Amino acid sequence: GVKVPRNFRLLEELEEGQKGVGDGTVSWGLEDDEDMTLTRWTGMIIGPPRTIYENRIYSLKIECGPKYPEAPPFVRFVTKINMNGVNSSNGVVDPRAISVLAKWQNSYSIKVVLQELRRLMMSKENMKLPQPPEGQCYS
Numbered sequence: 001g002v003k004v005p006r007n008f009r010l011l012e013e014l015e016e017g018q019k020g021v022g023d024g025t026v027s028w029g030l031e032d033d034e035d036m037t038l039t040r041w042t043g044m045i046i047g048p049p050r051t052i053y054e055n056r057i058y059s060l061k062i063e064c065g066p067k068y069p070e071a072p073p074f075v076r077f078v079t080k081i082n083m084n085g086v087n088s089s090n091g092v093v094d095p096r097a098i099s100v101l102a103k104w105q106n107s108y109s110i111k112v113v114l115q116e117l118r119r120l121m122m123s124k125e126n127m128k129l130p131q132p133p134e135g136q137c138y139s
Contacts (some may be wrong), residue, residue: 009069010038013110026114031061039064042076045118048050051127053081056134060117062110072104075113079134082122082129091138092118 017028025048031040043060047053060076065071077091078082085097095101100108102118120126 003066006064006066006068007038009109012062014038016111021111026118027061027116028110033046043074043080043114044109045121048118048127051122052129052131053121053127054125056131059137060114060127061125062113064111069106072101072108073110073113075101075117076138078137080132080138082131084125085120089138103109 005078013028019094021027027044027047028041030038031042034116040125041062041064045058045060047056047058057079058068058081061078063074065074072095075093077086079091080088082088085094086092087094093101095104098113098116098120100112
């Protein structure tokens with residue numbers, strides 16, 4: 001049931017998410033403020049300037065399982081997006097496509113995942129990809 005190292009870590013991540021973090025351009029918090037298991041999180045990425053994503057906000061669902069942080073979280077975009085490493089029909093982020101997920105370290109975190117996805121949005125492979133209309137979400 002209650003795994004101390006896991007829960008301690010997720011509470012640290014919760015506290016970190018409640019205050020400004022990194023460069024301020026990604027944020028996270030619990031999807032449901034009553035989920036005492038700390039499993040389901042909402043991620044957010046501010047669409048980067050000078051890319052096709054500019055002036056849009058992106059929502060994500062991040063699930064931190066029983067084995068987190070020893071095992072990487074499951075990550076999917078909610079906001080519809082065309083981006084390498086993400087399934088265009090369901091938003092699931094392919095772990096093999098994302099260095100920090102493919103090569104997960106237990107020192108990584110929800111923050112690191114979101115920061116790396118934001119960095120990837122700015123990369124040459126993604127920054128000009130035509131996008132679905134705004135306000136489309138995967139269910």
